[PDB]
Write a structure and sequence with these properties.
The modification N-acetylalanine is found at residue 5. Belongs to the calbindin family. The protein has a domain at 176-253: Orthogonal Bundle (Recoverin, domain 1), CATH 1.10.238.10. The chain is 53% helix and 0% strand. It is built from 14 helices and no strands. Bound molecules: calcium ion (4 copies).
Length: 255
């Protein structure tokens, strides 16, 4: 359990289940990030643990302690995480927002608007096979279960776009700025109808640009008109060949 983290920080190599217990030990509010007292507790306990183990700090541990709000992905690279689990965070599909949006569309194969366990399993299996690793069904089931528990913020047993997007670095995750912009179904449906200006049933890139300019204007504290081109490019990656249907735009704007 999370109490075992003190023992885990002394390990030569940390299993995915151990990394999960470390995360839950320090993340006292379950917010998905270590900050303030939680981060200070990690810095103190990581150094005390390697000392108790009679070990030196690895180069990544030295660089982390020297330069310290950090998330789950950053912690996985600092610690001696087991190889096949750490490989799941060294994907260009989780480093570029545009490539992550294409990955979401690729792996939501039942068009449910969520990534369910079996879809997440297929994504992780494909990442491992791309790295030439032979997948063991038991460990893959364990990795999938732990990745879901780490990122399923609302505990509904599946991932929504904003949950899985937290695998991205803070700078690429534009969805953090769209948090308080999300609308209910009725209001969203009214906006979709307004912004489909030619009335052909979908929103194209020119129509999305008008939408994004209007959203920037009404949410000055959250969005930035100078990043419209990036917002446009990220959102167009969820489209069906340049066509944003109601369910595609709902992923970004509907609560
Ligand atoms: Ca926290
Ligand atoms: Ca799905
Ligand atoms: Ca969820
Ligand atoms: Ca249209």
């Amino acid at each position: 359990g999370p109490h075992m983290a003190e023992s885990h920080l002394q390990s030569s190599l940390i299993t995915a289940s151990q990394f999960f217990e470390i995360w839950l030990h320090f993340d006292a509010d379950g917010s998905g990030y270590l900050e303030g007292k939680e981060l200070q507790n990690l810095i103190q306990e990581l150094q005390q643990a390697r000392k108790k183990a009679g070990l030196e700090l690895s180069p990544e541990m030295k660089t982390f302690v020297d330069q310290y709000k950090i998330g789950i992905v950053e912690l996985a690279h600092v610690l001696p995480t087991e190889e096949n689990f750490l490989l799941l965070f060294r994907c260009q599909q989780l480093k570029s927002c545009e490539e992550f949006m294409k990955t979401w569309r690729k792996y939501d194969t039942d068009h449910s608007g969520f990534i369910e366990t079996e879809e997440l399993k297929n994504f992780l299996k494909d990442l491992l096979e791309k790295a030439n690793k032979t997948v063991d069904d038991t460990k893959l089931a364990e990795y999938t279960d732990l990745m879901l528990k780490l990122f399923d913020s609302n505990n509904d047993g599946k991932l929504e776009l904003t949950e899985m997007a937290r695998l991205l670095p803070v700078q690429e995750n534009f969805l953090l700025k769209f948090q308080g912009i999300k609308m209910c179904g009725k209001e969203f449906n009214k906006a979709f109808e307004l912004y489909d200006q030619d009335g052909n049933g979908y929103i194209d890139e020119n129509e999305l640009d008008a939408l994004l300019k209007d959203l920037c204007e009404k949410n000055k504290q959250d969005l930035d008109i100078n990043n419209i081109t990036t917002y446009k490019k990220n959102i167009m990656a969820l489209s069906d060949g340049g066509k944003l249907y109601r369910t595609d735009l709902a992923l970004i704007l509907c609560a």
